[PDB]
């Protein structure tokens, strides 16, 4: 009586095409706030003058 199920399943078969195959996504949400930045890259820390 017109109350659809909000969820729906994906079909990931090995015979799927390039537009249907699964793609594992990892969105690295970077942010630049005024707080001390704890996440950094592997840059060699130098001395201080």
């Amino acid at each position, epitope marked *: 009586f017109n109350c659809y199920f909000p969820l*729906q399943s994906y079909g990931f078969q090995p015979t799927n*095409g390039v*537009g*249907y195959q699964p793609y594992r996504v990892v969105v690295l949400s970077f942010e630049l706030l005024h707080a001390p930045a704890t996440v950094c890259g592997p840059k060699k820390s130098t001395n201080l003058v």
Partner: antibody
Amino acid sequence: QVQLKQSGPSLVQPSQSLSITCTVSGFSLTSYGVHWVRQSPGKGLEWLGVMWRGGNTDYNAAFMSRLSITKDNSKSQVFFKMNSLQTDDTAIYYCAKNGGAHAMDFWGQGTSVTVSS
Amino acid sequence: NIVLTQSPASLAVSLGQRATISCRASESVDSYGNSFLHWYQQKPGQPPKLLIYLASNLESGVPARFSGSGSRTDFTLTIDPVEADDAATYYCQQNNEDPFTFGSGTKLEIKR
């Protein structure tokens, strides 16, 4: 992996009843509501009914008083009881899995039920 | 009651062209938040399959050549390009009001 084929009827006369046995596989009966339709008897595709997940069931306006759905959750089989059939109702009857927006995602092979004296 | 007077009754579209299968409806609004419907396919030598759900989305197992959109009553199923997997009858189904009837059925013929 998925099987929704029908069987059970051989031949039926007009204005009589019958019983269909649709073997469900690939998904649990408590997870999706098995739909029930025909295969184009003359005019476009005809919809009959659907048994929801452990609740009530909807039927067609022209087949609510005659056709009924009997869903067996223990045997993983959905039985169908039809009454007062006409020769024009001859078509292949299908079972299908419920989708997200009440869609029919999977479809079976069905069985060609023939009505004739 | 919804009378899905789907038109045309049949098509003759050659390979590589665009086939248009319209579907006329009468009711209703707010299927999920809009006035879309589902599309299906019934092949003569293979069981049927679901092509498009909500008339705007792709389904696994079938190619992405099937697309389209639709208004409250003026719906459209676009098959572009036409390949050798389209010779079958196409239907449209509304599910926002009982009975969940289908369209009249457009028998697409591959015009080779």
